[PDB]
From a paper:
Herein, we present the cryo-EM structure of fibrils extracted post-mortem from the diseased kidney of a DSH cat with systemic AA amyloidosis, deceased in a shelter with extreme disease prevalence. About 65k from initially 380k segments were refined with C2 symmetry, a left-handed twist angle of 1.3° and a helical rise of 4.9 Å to yield a final map with a nominal resolution of 3.3 Å, as estimated from half-map Fourier shell correlation curves (FSC). The fibril structure is composed of two identical proto-filaments, and exhibits the cross-β architecture characteristic of amyloid. The polypeptide of each proto-filament comprises 11 β-strands between residue positions 19 and 94 and adopts an extended hairpin structure. A central β-arch between residues Asp-50 and Arg-64 links two ~25 residue long meandering tails that stick together via side chain contacts. A noteworthy feature following the β-arch is an unusual backbone bulge adopted by the P66GGAW70 segment comprising Pro-66 modeled as cis-isomer, in contrast to the trans-Proline residues in mouse and human AA amyloid. In the assembled fibril, the N-terminal tails are surface-exposed at the edges, while the C-terminal tails are buried facing each other. At the intra-protomer interface, the edge-tail of rung layer (i) contacts the face-tails (i-1) to (i + 2), creating four hydrophobic clusters, four ionic locks and additional H-bond interactions. On the other side, at the inter-protomer interface, the face-tail (i) contacts four rung layers of the adjacent proto-filament, creating two hydrophobic clusters, four ionic locks and two additional H-bond interactions. The higher dissociation cost is mainly caused by the eight-residue insert that increases fibril core mass and enlarges the buried surface area by ~2000 Å2.
Specifically, AA amyloidosis represents a systemic disease characterized by the deposition of misfolded serum amyloid A protein (SAA) in multiple organs. This 12–14 kDa remarkably conserved apo-lipoprotein acts as molecular mop to remove membrane debris and lipid degradation products from inflammatory injury sites. As part of the host innate response to inflammation, acute-phase SAA is secreted by the liver to increase serum levels up to 1000-fold. Chronic inflammation leads to sustained increased SAA concentrations, to an extent that macrophages reportedly fail to prevent proteolysis-resistant oligomers during lysosomal degradation.
Numbering used by the authors:
A (entry chain A), B (entry chain C), C (entry chain E), D (entry chain B), E (entry chain D), F (entry chain J), ...: 19 to 94
Write the structure that this text describes.
Amino acid sequence: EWYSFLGEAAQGAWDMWRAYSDMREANYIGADKYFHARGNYDAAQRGPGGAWAAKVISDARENSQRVTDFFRHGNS
Amino acid sequence: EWYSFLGEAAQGAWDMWRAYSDMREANYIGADKYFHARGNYDAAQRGPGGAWAAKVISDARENSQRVTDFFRHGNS
Amino acid sequence: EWYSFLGEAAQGAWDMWRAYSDMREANYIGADKYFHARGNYDAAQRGPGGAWAAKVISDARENSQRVTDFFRHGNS
Amino acid sequence: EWYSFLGEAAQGAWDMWRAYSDMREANYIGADKYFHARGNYDAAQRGPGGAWAAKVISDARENSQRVTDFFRHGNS
Amino acid sequence: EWYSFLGEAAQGAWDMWRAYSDMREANYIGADKYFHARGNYDAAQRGPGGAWAAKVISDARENSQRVTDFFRHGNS
Amino acid sequence: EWYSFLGEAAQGAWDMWRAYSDMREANYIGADKYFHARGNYDAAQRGPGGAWAAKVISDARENSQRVTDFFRHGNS
Amino acid sequence: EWYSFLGEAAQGAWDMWRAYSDMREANYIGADKYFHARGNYDAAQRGPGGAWAAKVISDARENSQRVTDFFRHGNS
Amino acid sequence: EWYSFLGEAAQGAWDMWRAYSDMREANYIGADKYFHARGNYDAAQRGPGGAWAAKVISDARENSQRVTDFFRHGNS
Amino acid sequence: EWYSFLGEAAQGAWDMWRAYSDMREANYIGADKYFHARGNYDAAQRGPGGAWAAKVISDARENSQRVTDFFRHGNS
Amino acid sequence: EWYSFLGEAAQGAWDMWRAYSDMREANYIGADKYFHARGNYDAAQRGPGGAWAAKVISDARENSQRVTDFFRHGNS
């Protein structure tokens, strides 16, 4: 008897591995690059503002589980 | 008896692996690049504003499970 | 007896793997590139604003399962 | 009897490992780079402001579990 | 009897290890770099302000668990 | 605009009520009543045994819902 | 705009109420009543045994909900 | 705008109330009543035994909820 | 704007109240009543034994909640 | 703006009250009543034994809550 319901099961070699995750300069918020500027934004309003968040994540687990009413008996 | 319901099962070599994930400069929000500007945005309003979020993720698991009323008996 | 209902089952070599995921500069929101500008957006309103979100994801699992009333008996 | 419900199970060599996570300069908020500027932002208002947060994470686990009413009996 | 519900189980060699986590210069908030500037921000207001936080984390665990009503009996 | 998808909506009087639920002596498991017995069950084995449960419920709700990607805008 | 998805909504009088739930002597497990017995069950084995539970409930709610990615904007 | 997803909402009088819950002598486990007995159960084994639980509940709430990524903006 | 997700909301009189919960003599475990007995259970073994619990509850709340990533903005 | 997620909210009179909880003689464990007995249980073993608990509760709250990443902004 071998049962699985949501399962990462590996019975061998070089299985389910992950090598390269490459995210360079992913998230620029309200930034400027390689420019020449004169007198712009006179008396202006520029973001970020209000209620906000910026998140950068590579690997993360946030599982949740609900186990109830589990009965197990052996050999009779 | 071998049963699975939602299952990642590998019984061999070099199975289900993932090598390259390449997302360079994916998410620019309200940014400028390689420009020449004079006197623009006079007394203007520029975002980001309000209620917002920017998220960049490579690998993430957020499973949830509900197990109820599970009965197991052996040999009689 | 071998049963599956929704199942990723591999019994061999070099099966179900995924190598290259390439999404460069995928998501530019309200950004400008390689321009020359004078006096535009005078007293104007420019987004992003309000209630919004930008998300870039490569690999993600968000399964959910509901298991109820599972009975198992052995040999008599 | 081998059962799993949400399970990372490896019965071999070189399985489920993760080598490279590369996120350089991921999150620039209200920053400028490689520019020449004169007299801009006269009497202007510039973010970040309000209620906000910036988070950069590589590896993180935030699981939660709810186990109730678990009964186990042996051999009779 | 071998059961797991949320489980990192390794029965071998070189399994589930993690080698490189590389996040250089990830989080610049309201910073400037490699620039020449004259007379900008005259009588202006510049962030960061208000209620905010910046966090950079490599590895972190924040699990929580709720175990109730667990009954175990041996051999009869 | 009035929309419903799975909905118990009552706009009146004396609607959808439930008065009498009468289940007397519903569930007798391995019980005997009003008998005369001599010497039966000599060296015998009688249930209940193994992995089992008996539940009697009158009213119970165990709904579950999955809401994703809900966007609402007002008047322009 | 009035929307509901799974909803108990009452806009009146004497709606959706529940008065009588009557379950007398519902659950007798391995019990005997009104009998005369001599010498039975000599050297015998009688249940309840193993892994089991008996539960009697009148009213109970065990809902669960999953809300994700909800965006709301007002008037423009 | 009035929205509900799983909701007990009453806008009136005498709605959704519950008056009588009557469960007398519901749960007798291994009990005997109104009998005359001689010499039975000689050298016998009688339950309850093993891993078991008996629970009687009238009213109980065990809800659980998962709220993520909720954005709200006002009037512009 | 009026929103609810799992909500007991009453906007009136005599709503959602509960008056009578009557569970007399609900849970007798290994008890005897109104009997005449001679010489039974000679050298016998009688439960309760092992790992067990008996619980009687009238009203109880055991909710749990998970709130994450909640953003609220006002009027602009 | 009026929002609730798991909420007991009453905006009126005589709402959500609970008057009578009546559980007389609910939990008798290994007790005898109104009997005449001679010479029974000769050299016998009688429960309760092992690891067990008996609990009787009328009203009890055991909530738990997990609040994370909550951002609130006012008027702009």
